[PDB]
Amino acid sequence: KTVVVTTILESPYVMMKKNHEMLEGNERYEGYCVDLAAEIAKHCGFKYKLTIVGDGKYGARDADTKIWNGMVGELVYGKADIAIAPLTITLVREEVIDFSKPFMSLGISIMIKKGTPIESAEDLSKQTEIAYGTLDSGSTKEFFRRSKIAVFDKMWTYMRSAEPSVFVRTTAEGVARVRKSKGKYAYLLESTMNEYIEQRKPCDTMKVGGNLDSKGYGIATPKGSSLGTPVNLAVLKLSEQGVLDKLKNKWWYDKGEC
Amino acid sequence: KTVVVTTILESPYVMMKKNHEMLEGNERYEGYCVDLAAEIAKHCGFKYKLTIVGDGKYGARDADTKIWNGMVGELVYGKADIAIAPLTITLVREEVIDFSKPFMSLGISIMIKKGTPIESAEDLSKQTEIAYGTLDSGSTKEFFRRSKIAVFDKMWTYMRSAEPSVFVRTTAEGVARVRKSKGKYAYLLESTMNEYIEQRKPCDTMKVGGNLDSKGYGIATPKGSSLGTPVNLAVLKLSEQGVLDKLKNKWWYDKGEC
Ligand SMILES: N[C@@H](Cn1cc([N+](=O)[O-])c(=O)[nH]c1=O)C(=O)O
Numbered sequence: 408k409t410v411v412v413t414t415i416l417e418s419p420y421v422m423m424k425k426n427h428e429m430l431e432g433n434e435r436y437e438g439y440c441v442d443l444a445a446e447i448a449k450h451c452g453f454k455y456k457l458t459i460v461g462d463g464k465y466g467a468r469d470a471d472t473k474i475w476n477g478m479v480g481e482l483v484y485g486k487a488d489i490a491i492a493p494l495t496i497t498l499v500r501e502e503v504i505d506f507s508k509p510f511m512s513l514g515i516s517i518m519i520k521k522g523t524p525i526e527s528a529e530d531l532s533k534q535t536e537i538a539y540g541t542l543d544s545g546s547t548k549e550f551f552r553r554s555k556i557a558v559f560d561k562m563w564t565y566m567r568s569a570e571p572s573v574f575v576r577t578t579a580e581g582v583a584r585v586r587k588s589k590g591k592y593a594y595l596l597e598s599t600m601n602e603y604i605e606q607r608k609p610c611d612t613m614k615v616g617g618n619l620d621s622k623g624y625g626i627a628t629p630k631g632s633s634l635g636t637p638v639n640l641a642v643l644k645l646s647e648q649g650v651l652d653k654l655k656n657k658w659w660y661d662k663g664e665c
Numbered sequence: 666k667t668v669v670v671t672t673i674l675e676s677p678y679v680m681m682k683k684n685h686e687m688l689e690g691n692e693r694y695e696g697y698c699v700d701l702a703a704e705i706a707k708h709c710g711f712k713y714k715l716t717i718v719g720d721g722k723y724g725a726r727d728a729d730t731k732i733w734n735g736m737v738g739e740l741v742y743g744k745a746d747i748a749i750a751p752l753t754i755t756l757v758r759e760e761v762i763d764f765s766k767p768f769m770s771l772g773i774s775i776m777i778k779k780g781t782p783i784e785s786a787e788d789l790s791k792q793t794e795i796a797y798g799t800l801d802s803g804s805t806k807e808f809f810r811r812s813k814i815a816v817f818d819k820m821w822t823y824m825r826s827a828e829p830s831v832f833v834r835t836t837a838e839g840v841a842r843v844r845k846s847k848g849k850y851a852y853l854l855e856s857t858m859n860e861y862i863e864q865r866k867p868c869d870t871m872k873v874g875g876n877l878d879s880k881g882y883g884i885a886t887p888k889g890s891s892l893g894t895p896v897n898l899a900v901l902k903l904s905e906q907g908v909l910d911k912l913k914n915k916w917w918y919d920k921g922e923c
Pocket residue numbers: 417465466493494495496542544545546547548578595596597600601
């Protein structure tokens with residue numbers, strides 16, 4: 408049985424290769440998670456096909472219907488056997504799917520156009536000249552929605568009602584919005600992405616302040632899947648072998664252009 | 666049934682209260698892990714008894730007898746129901762006990778007496794004037810014994826054969842050795858401990874360089890135990906509701922003496 412892997416186009420985790428049009432199957436893709444997938448499959452001994460999540464979302468549960476979308480939904484409804492992606496380990500997800508131990512740590516962070524007069528989340532919350540938002544479906548939005556911290560709740564109150572909307576469908580759209588907004592939009596996004604983007608041309612963005620939280624990405628499987636245990640053990644093995652660090656260095660800093 | 670919790674006297678995770686001789690049961694202890702245990706218990710809905718691990722050890726498998734010592738052994742042999750302590754999530758332990766998702770991130774780091782001419786593991790590995798060692802049992806030592814990375818193996822090769830022994834029995838012993846050795850002993854230890862000590866009088870130590878690796882502490886339960894699921898969910902809930910961050914700040918920095 409070939410294992411169906413659900414993933415998402417998000418640099419430098421999974422990207423189309425320069426010459427992908429002349430390539431087929433898994434070979435079209437490169438990135439940290441593409442490499443992680445190959446290692447996991449090697450150590451657990453399976454063959455697999457990478458497939459990009461149809462709706463291009465990470466996964467949230469619809470309030471009215473209670474149906475899960477995104478990569479999470481593909482696992483929940485049996486469309487994929489495993490998700491190998493920058494997928495945040497969260498409580499609401501852990502209730503419907505299984506996560507391995509984390510293969511990467513991260514936090515929510517702030518991205519600004521260079522020269523923007525912002526140093527912190529508190530700075531953002533105390534002003535109005537500069538708009539700010541998050542990836543409009545995923546763990547970061549849910550963080551602000553659920554936050555009982557005054558600074559973040561204040562920010563959520565602003566974001567939920569902002570007009571026009573401050574939420575974006577993809578990271579690419581968020582970043583483009585910072586780049587074109589002349590310093591009038593700051594983007595809240597995961598630190599790993601922020602750090603990658605800061606080192607790529609045109610080198611006009613930067614991460615400011617510390618992370619707003621601490622969490623991790625894990626490999627996800629359907630609850631009670633037989634893949635859950637071997638995969639978890641494979642992640643810890645790769646961590647202890649230094650492989651996760653090697654991949655991180657390969658995809659972030661060896662790819663710096665600034 | 667009252668849940669038996671195994672833990673270890675290691676500041677500031679668990680410490681004897683000043684008037685402990687006058688107190689009983691759980692009230693004898695204080696620290697990050699005592700606070701965490703209270704929250705875990707409250708969220709899972711169980712009564713518990715804190716007990717200090719008899720042999721004062723974290724957990725290793727004796728190569729000869731194959732017997733597990735430390736907190737891991739107390740779980741494997743059924744002497745405790747759960748371990749709430751700075752216990753590192755590792756592959757070999759995951760094979761015999763269950764771990765929650767990590768409640769704290771960390772890495773192996775270098776502690777020096779202020780003014781020691783050392784900035785990194787490479788620096789340490791390329792010289793012999795300054796001695797260096799690790800806790801004589803635990804995941805840090807195992808990290809070096811197992812590492813296939815040139816620098817860390819070079820360090821291990823030095824450390825296993827160094828005489829007198831560069832290894833120490835307790836964190837306290839390592840720190841005292843740093844402080845007394847006039848810059849001629851550096852101590853390799855987990856970053857969280859390093860960070861704690863840097864804010865303690867006499868304020869004569871510091872963490873230098875990046876971390877050598879990345880990993881996490883997890884709450885541990887016997888394989889197959891029914892506490893595993895609720896406990897994991899409780900960890901994620903505490904992470905997301907900011908409790909883990911509050912606790913780290915309370916015990917590391919709010920008490921800061923430097
Ligand atoms: N990892 C998240 C998805 N996700 C991704 C990014 N991102 O890649 O910058 C983000 O800023 N916010 C977010 O919730 C999840 O799993 O929902």
